[PDB]
Symmetry: D2
């Protein structure tokens, strides 16, 4: 059994030892240390070379690795500075699939046009402020792209889905601060059935009266996200801010393995009800704005050289 | 200014007086009393007669549902459909007391599955909090669903049907043909159901599996985007009752869309604010910080169920 | 196995059937139904006829309260006394439906102050969640309190009184002499009130100020430690109803003290577990926890339990 | 206005820059950055040279900022016990306040360890073997005998703070928070001292050796004189509302806190300017100390 012991500041400030001491500190500090262990296990799996046999399985679809990592996050984390943390992972191909919620696409693209501010015509998101002007700049940028998307649908047989639209918006924003710029550049698909539930939806709706008939099919994206999970050698999940992806994915009939590694960081409670098996997930009960940068510092950022 | 005073049990037990006394009890009891007041205000607005030969904008809404003086949006998380709140929601939909439903992944199939086999109390099983759904329930559902999915794909070819989540949910409600089903009553009463996340759970696993046996099903979210927005834009007045989480974010006022803010908005959930989880403005919402499994039946008893005669 | 089924409003509004249907609704509704079952079992145990040597228990407990077949401890946070749940608690104490009260800093003075001036709904003021207590209410209480503290110090110094929080709370309840007061009824019915944190808030500010005018008041917690323990040790059976937080931690079973675990334990609060917040001794029964604001749940619980057995307490 | 921007890991892992970037990250990360600013302001005030003992009835010399450190007992069961012990060891705080269990869980750890989980006492994901309490009871009983004798023969008027100082002196172990508090004349307040296991043992002891008195009114005067004679007041309150923020009282000559940080996961909705970080203090408090007190070790 491991004894409870906190970091001793009589040693001075050794940041690596202080962060490792979370594991023996207890409560959510211990969950954080278990999350670091799970994510380091994911990364070490991902960096294992595929055999010529495994490599063959992999190509039945970006290059397959030994661990396909799904990174799911709520839109609020894109409004926060965690946008930079996510952009870094996507930029360096450290994760394979993104899943987000309503607002999670446009809040990244808008930040390329105008900043979000700290608080305590304004959109308030917790202690953040997005001036209404930011949405106006975004709408002016978006409308011509929606025109091209409808023309391509009608003249070049394009069958749009949320993931194909998000790839197109990332290509158009053409800005290395953008999560979605890097995802499309690095062939990391982005899934968001809720893509139209917020401001981007208001704009697509408005656009549809002057230029009707845009179709966004969710069933083709249903097949694409499943293909990422079914053809994976191994599956990891890092899910932030809420239940963006429920942990139970193991499905014998679909040939879909459970995740070998799963980390959840959120402040949701269980009490109101909010093939390889599904591994026991690690849950850190904490604001991901605090915890996710610390997790990335102790895991992905330690293996930067291997992803360059 | 209103004095804090709880119900006096020396009066014995008058449930109406006990429930009204929540308003002066404080903390979330007071919020419950304010939620009762807001929903009763919504209902009284809805029951106001609408102006003579009123422009329906049936051509603008593409809906067969007649306009009332207050369009009520009822949003709820799937977990509430697994709970007994399924019965509470089914009652409101059955009596045309709400106009639009919005739900999350699982919120459709957990209602339909309960028509085939029961969900059980806990403490091959799917655990949802203290509830248990036997895996066999999903097997029965899949056997029932596959032939309907076949008909839906063929109707794209034979009838020019352009499926959306709302149109699929109405079809599944018609097929289940069971008056215990929320979705049976919604399609019978022309109450549309919106759920872009329709395919994110077990129903999605089945649609995915079916799509290799019978390819072609398209579910378009943009036509549903237009349908849900036109319900809010052509509303004379808007009410929102949102349960279990942020199924719908409160700020809907949009001058460019001529979309009024809600005049009345009630939220019942246990989510925290601290981690960030011309047109009429968005009225200040009432939030009751509580499990909707406790609060929603009490809310309905003191509001909709009091005005059953008018519906 | 019990099927999940909510109340069907097609039956109309039958409040008793609606409240019973919480049991089959799931999530915290089911926990509420379990809490009603546990409290009804506590009350039915309490109402079972006893035989016992009255003088004998009295000399061991140093209490005038007669033993029943179940000793019920009611614990609550001070915020619930600021709320309308003050009326709910006062009712239970008035009718001798509970045996012992335990509260936290503020839980005594917020009841006494309401006898002098009202607390108001919000959304010089003390804000307690969405409640407002005007600062003037505390000034009226201070004016009322100072002469009583003078008498308490005189009785200590001339009549050998050894003050404890429970003895002080009984004296304040006697002095307020107002049937709206929880503490008026507790002292009238010989229900002791325990609060080691009695002086951590406004009442403490006033005791502190008074000690400059009239020094040497002693409030001993060790004699109260013995009084609360003897209530639990000489209990035939123990129930706990704990509101608003962990006012009393549920594990009380102690072989060395001959202190039985609770046979029935109900907790109503919104606290989380995640941040760490010989067949002769009865075990600690598994508690029922309802994750809910007690301001909503406690009156419903009382309606379906204690209020149904009012006849047996007359 | 400050722009929202997270730490860019393209810059590599620079821990000081990463921790500062919490300030511009938003949500509770921003609150953490504000908490570091408030505590650094407290420390800078405390280290200002000053231009009392008969008024406070304390041997502790006044500084330019009196810091009250309040914490729930669960944090003493956690590894935050080490973080608290460090601050007390180096006289970086002036007054401790805790809740039921917060004294004995420090002393018991000097006799036997607490273990990680997921005859055992469970405290969240921590395990305290029942034998730990048995070793503590064996150690405690002789001290209680001496305390009652000193009361009855040497006129000692015990209070929770005087008992906690005595237990810290007796444990005589530099891993103990309460050892360092009594060594450094840092008083510890706990009216709830007897609500838990230590109370069970004092109660048991009272049968064979009756009449121990623990007075709370003398402690009421001692904690107030710490606040009244303060030039400036800082509060660091962990795990819950151990001390409510509003202390300003004109009639008592008691100033409000100039600086206040609260770290806990309590919600305001059921009725349970300071900086509040809504977070488990087991995660946040070591980071806060690393960027504040530990940076100024030389000055202490
Ligand atoms: C993780 C997935 C491979 C499996 C899992 C099965 N429950 N699953 C599927 C889709 C899925 C989607 C989705 C659906 C359709 C189109 N675009 C995205 C979105 C969010 C979560 C999931 C999700 O959790
Ligand atoms: C409530 C709505 C009238 C406006 C509001 C604007 N933020 N809005 C829009 C769509 C919407 C949708 C949606 C989108 C597309 C297809 N089916 C459903 C789903 C959930 C929430 C919203 C939602 O909150
Ligand atoms: C409930 C009790 C019989 C036993 C239990 C043992 N853990 N216990 C004891 C005292 C106790 C007290 C107390 C202490 C001293 C004076 N006045 C009140 C206060 C709050 C909780 C408890 C409490 O939880
Ligand atoms: C911080 C204090 C100077 C003033 C403040 C006024 N509300 N105050 C007082 C006592 C106090 C005590 C206390 C009381 C008596 C004996 N031992 C400790 C415990 C906890 C918090 C407080 C507390 O918050």
């Amino acid at each position: 059994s491991t004894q409870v012991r906190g970091y001793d500041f009589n040693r001075g400030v050794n940041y690596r030892a202080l962060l490792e001491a979370f594991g023996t500190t207890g409560f959510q500090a211990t969950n954080f240390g278990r999350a670091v262990q799970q994510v380091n296990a994911m990364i070490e799996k991902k960096l294992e070379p595929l055999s010529q046999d495994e490599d063959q399985h992999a190509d039945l679809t970006r290059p397959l690795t030994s661990c396909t990592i799904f990174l799911g996050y709520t839109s609020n984390l894109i409004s926060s500075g965690i946008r930079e943390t996510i952009r870094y992972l996507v930029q360096h191909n450290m994760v394979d699939v993104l899943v987000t919620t309503a607002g999670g696409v446009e809040e990244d693209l808008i930040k390329c046009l105008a900043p979000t501010y700290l608080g305590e015509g304004i959109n308030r998101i917790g202690n953040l402020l997005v001036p209404n002007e930011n949405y106006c700049k975004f709408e002016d940028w978006l409308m011509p792209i929606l025109d091209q998307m409808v023309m391509e649908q009608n003249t070049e047989g394009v069958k749009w889905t949320p993931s194909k639209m998000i790839a197109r918006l990332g290509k158009e924003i053409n800005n290395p601060e953008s999560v979605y710029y890097w995802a499309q550049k690095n062939h990391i698909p982005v899934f968001s059935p809720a893509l139209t539930d917020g401001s981007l939806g208001d704009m697509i709706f408005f656009h549809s009266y002057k230029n009707p008939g845009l179709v966004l099919d969710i069933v083709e994206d249903l097949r694409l996200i499943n293909t990422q999970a079914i053809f994976a050698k191994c599956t990891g999940m890092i899910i932030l801010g809420g239940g963006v992806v429920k942990h139970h994915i193991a499905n014998a009939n679909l040939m879909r393995n459970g995740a070998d590694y799963a980390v959840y960081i959120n402040t949701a409670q269980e009490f109101d009800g909010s093939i390889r098996v599904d591994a026991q997930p690690v849950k850190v009960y904490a604001d991901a704005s605090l915890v996710f940068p610390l997790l990335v510092a102790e895991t992905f950022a330690q293996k930067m050289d291997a992803f360059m």
